[PDB]
Design a protein around this ligand. Structure first.
Ligand SMILES: *[C@@H]1O[C@H](CO)[C@@H](O)[C@H](O)[C@H]1NC(C)=O
Lengths: 388, 145, 49
């Protein structure tokens, strides 16, 4: 029982592929076995993505797991929506209803707007990356008219390789011109790391500044460097390490050799890798349920060419999509459930704060509640003088 | 992608056509890879894209200069995503540099279904307070709507 | 020490540091360079010779 599936990874994805293998081994069963075909390629090049996809389709896979960028997303959604091949991804959710695409990554918009509303910011600067996507920008801009906000949006995404460190000094000093202490980041962990590092270099991490790191991994990058700064830093965490399942995972994860499973020896794991693992679980449950529901999905013939005119799609793909979207499980990212579009529904995003003794969980965010406050409310005698 | 891979098989020397925000990356990537020259009247790409000739002239500079000419320090900006978000970044950075109060609203790309329902209250909320200056960035038909 | 100073963020323009050692430019000076704080030290090897 070999089930051929496709996988598409960037040339710069190590821990993700490692976690993929971890999912392959941990969730492998005796009933059936998945047989992954792996292709490392440049994600930004649509031609390369298309080439690899037509190759995978020539192999005749049942489902494809992979990543995409703002350049290659339309190719993926259009091709999968065309040929009826199921696609699973950790990458950013598309804006719209895109069929045959399962976005494992949950939406952060609600939690962010709820957070800004929580801290009552009426004026701030918002740094955005064009290399990822401009959706959240539109979100907070449209929200600015309703909530009466003064938002100064700056693109950090257009920066050269050699001159990229000037634009940061100019940015922060122009913010000295605007005298605005509240900032939001939302970028790649590496780009974020560079930003934080330059914040430390210019030394704007002193008390009085307030930063919001918008990403799902709060603890994935090194944020220890800004910890003793004195500036308040809030972010979101999708992987709660205080869970039994997560701990039993980290136990095995930490016991892996870094030579065989790159960047897996760490006790902390990037949320993307976690999403990959959970994706493996989900696919496994989906095909297991297909065999359990007595639905014959095996293709008797070859799918052949993806460029055949007119395009002839296979039928079992619909059944696979239905199987995938109807999966409800428990992974590293918490409760996993999908809607008819494939987006994540009913998820819990921990709201985290960075203090002196490290990160602490203040909130828990949901789609329906839109807000939840954990007890918190610590009181100290320090800097509180009982009246005389 | 299919039509491009075709006709190229016929061995054409140059390809003339149009593109949208969804298919633009396909055209530019494929033409930049296979070295097939592509001509378009549609919106210019944001960046340096080789083997692509954008016949359409840039409109950002003229817009910012016109806005500066009418001396508007506060205005509303309605935009569609189908032509690109470059002009948006332009007016945002120009708002940061020239100290403008710009209220930009996207009606484009159907980015939110919510708004469609009870959008009138929004437009009227901006209609009661200020909003003396408005700029339309859309398709001729969308403009008409 | 310098690293702990930048981490706690006392390298702002109000503070003044003196490196008394023979190598001033031998250590990593990029990190406190952009701080805005004045840092003066001693150098025994003149590269202008
Ligand atoms: C999420 O759906 C679950 C099933 O895990 C249920 O326990 C709970 O109702 C949920 N939260 C909401 C807001 O429906």
């Amino acid at each position: 029982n070999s089930i051929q599936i496709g996988g598409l990874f960037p040339r710069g994805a190590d821990q993700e592929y490692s976690a993929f293998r971890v999912g392959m081994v941990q969730f492998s069963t005796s009933e059936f076995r998945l047989t992954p075909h792996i292709d490392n390629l440049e994600v930004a090049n649509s031609f390369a993505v298309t080439n690899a996809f037509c190759s995978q389709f020539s192999r005749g896979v049942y489902a494809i797991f992979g990543f995409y960028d703002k350049k290659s997303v339309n190719t993926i959604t259009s091709f999968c929506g065309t040929l009826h091949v199921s696609f699973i991804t950790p990458s950013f959710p598309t804006d719209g209803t895109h069929p045959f695409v399962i976005q494992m990554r949950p939406d952060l918009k609600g939690a962010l707007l709820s957070l800004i509303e929580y801290y009552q910011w009426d004026k701030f600067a918002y740094l955005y990356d064009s290399d990822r996507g401009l959706s959240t920008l539109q979100a907070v801009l449209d929200s600015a008219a309703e909530k009466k906000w003064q938002v100064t949006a700056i693109n950090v995404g257009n920066i050269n390789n050699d001159k990229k460190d000037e634009t940061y000094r100019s940015l922060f000093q122009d913010l000295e011109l605007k005298k605005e202490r509240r900032v939001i980041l939302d970028c790649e962990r590496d780009k974020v790391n560079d930003i934080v590092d330059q914040v430390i270099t210019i030394g704007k991490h002193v008390k009085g500044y307030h930063y919001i790191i918008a990403n799902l991994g709060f603890t994935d990058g090194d944020l220890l460097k800004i910890q003793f700064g004195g500036a308040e830093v809030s972010g979101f965490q999708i992987v709660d390490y205080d869970d039994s399942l997560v701990s039993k995972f980290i136990e095995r994860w930490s016991t892996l050799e870094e030579k065989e499973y790159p960047g897996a020896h760490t006790a902390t794991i990037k949320y993307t890798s976690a999403l990959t693992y959970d994706a493996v679980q989900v696919m496994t449950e989906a095909f297991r349920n297909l065999r359990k529901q007595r639905i014959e999905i095996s293709r008797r013939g070859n799918a052949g060419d993806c460029l055949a005119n007119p395009a002839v799609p296979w039928g079992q793909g619909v059944e696979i999509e239905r199987a995938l979207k109807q999966v409800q499980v428990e992974g590293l990212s918490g409760n996993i459930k999908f809607d008819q579009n494939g987006k994540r529904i009913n998820y819990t995003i921990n709201i985290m704060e960075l203090k002196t003794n490290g990160p602490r969980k203040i909130g828990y965010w949901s789609e329906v509640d839109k807000m939840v406050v954990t007890l918190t409310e610590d009181d100290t005698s320090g800097l509180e003088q009982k009246t005389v």
